[PDB]
């Protein structure tokens, strides 16, 4: 978007965010965070930093249960469990498992 003429040009991140409904902050997260060298460990982390889950907080009343997931999910989580991205990580892995 140039402020000179006001014209828009579509980026391929634009096409992907429009085609899959992910918010503009989520594609900025996936533009910053997606490297060619990402493992399966870091891929769940890049997923868990989506702005769709910006209101997901980890409450203490479930933290014990989250630990019982974090010792059983098969992809390791680099975060600590009281950070929300670890919660979204182990909830996706507890879904697939």
């Amino acid at each position: 978007y140039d402020k000179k003429t006001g014209n828009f040009q579509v980026t391929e991140l634009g096409r992907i965010a429009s085609h899959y409904y992910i918010t503009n902050d989520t594609v900025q997260t996936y533009n910053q965070l997606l490297k060619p060298t990402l493992s399966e460990i870091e891929l769940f982390r890049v997923f868990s930093l989506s702005s769709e889950f910006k209101n997901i907080t980890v409450r203490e009343e479930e933290k014990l249960e989250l630990q019982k997931l974090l010792e059983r999910v098969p992809i390791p989580v680099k975060e600590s469990i009281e950070e929300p991205s670890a919660k979204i990580n182990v909830l996706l892995q507890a879904f697939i498992s």
Binding site: R45, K78, E79, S80, E83
Partner: protein, 330 residues
């Protein structure tokens, strides 16, 4: 300082090329702005006739000899020799033979002469402290190049014996026979002078006996050569490969600790501790943020010689910014 086959060989094309290169550089500078004089310069041509490329930079006297070009030889590890390998293919393509500049050995010799000449009315501890300071500055600046320079090792034991001889004639004007090294080399806490040694000092087995009496009686005991400083300073090639690989480890540890949102503690980076050319120590300083705004500090420490009359042996480094690049606790 190099052997005749290791210097620049003065073939006519190479000598004409060196003088031509120098003349081309000299014309670019107007004689009123600055001059570049042939007599204080050195132009080494490496060609098909000269197999060695020579230069004195920063007090080091370097001679690069390619593997393709007058090696023909298996080499073991020699200390002052820098195995120069290619960055992309990791093949040893040349060896840089290091030495200490004759001006630098002369600066160390004149520094010991300044210690001895202004010794006079001072304490033996202060004379040996000035010897230790000059010796640490020389030995930690010139690390491998000292072990390669045999003239400097001869000069080092000559200056060490000169300092010890001034201590001995401060004790008694009659020069002794078989003076014990224990009074020089004992650390200052344990009473001695705390002299650092860069020379072969064999301690006799006579000098290691000690008695001890309790009520069962007198029990006699015994315990060797004195450690030299070069064994306790890491070579510069080792310092640079460990600095490269340790600041690489710091980069990966820092990005994984920014991933974990925390700070890099002392428990990670404890294996990297006395390591790195900026030391990893320097990450854990209080003043470190302030030292992120101290730019040009190395040129400043070089130009301190025109402001401070005290000669700095660590003109090249600072304890604050580079860390302590040596460790003589062991």
């Amino acid at each position: 300082c190099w052997p005749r086959d290791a210097r620049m060989r003065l073939m006519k094309h190479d000598v004409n090329l060196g003088r031509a290169v120098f003349w081309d550089i000299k014309n670019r500078l107007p004689r009123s702005v600055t001059t570049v004089q042939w007599e204080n310069s050195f132009v080494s041509v490496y060609s098909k006739d000269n197999p060695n490329l020579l230069f004195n930079m920063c007090g080091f006297e370097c001679r690069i000899l390619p593997k393709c070009r007058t090696s023909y030889e298996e080499f073991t590890h020699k200390d002052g020799v820098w195995n120069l390998q290619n960055e992309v293919t990791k093949e040893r393509t040349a060896q840089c033979f290091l030495r200490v500049d004759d001006e630098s050995m002369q600066r160390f010799h004149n520094r010991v002469r300044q210690i001895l000449m202004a010794s006079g009315s001072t304490t033996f501890t202060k004379i040996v402290n000035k010897w230790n300071t000059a010796l640490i500055g020389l030995m930690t600046y010139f690390r491998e190049a000292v072990v390669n320079t045999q003239e400097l090792l001869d000069l080092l034991v000559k200056c060490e014996n000169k300092i010890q001889t001034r201590i001995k004639i401060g004790l008694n004007s009659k020069m002794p026979s078989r003076f014990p090294p224990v009074v020089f080399y004992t650390p200052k806490e344990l009473g001695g002078l705390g002299m650092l040694s860069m020379g072969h000092v064999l301690i006799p087995q006579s000098d290691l006996r000690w008695s001890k009496q309790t009520d069962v009686g007198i029990t006699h005991f015994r315990s060797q050569l004195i450690p030299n400083l070069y064994r306790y300073i890491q070579p510069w090639e080792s310092e640079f490969i460990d600095s490269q690989r340790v600041w690489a480890e710091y980069a990966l540890k820092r990005q994984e600790a920014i991933a974990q949102n925390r700070r890099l503690t002392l428990e990670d980076l404890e294996d990297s501790w006395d390591r790195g050319i900026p030391r990893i120590n320097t990450l854990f300083q209080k003043d470190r943020h302030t030292l992120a705004y101290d730019k040009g500090w190395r040129v400043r420490t070089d130009f301190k010689q025109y402001q401070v009359l005290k000669q700095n042996p660590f003109w090249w480094t600072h304890q604050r910014h580079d860390g302590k690049l040596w460790n003589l606790n062991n």
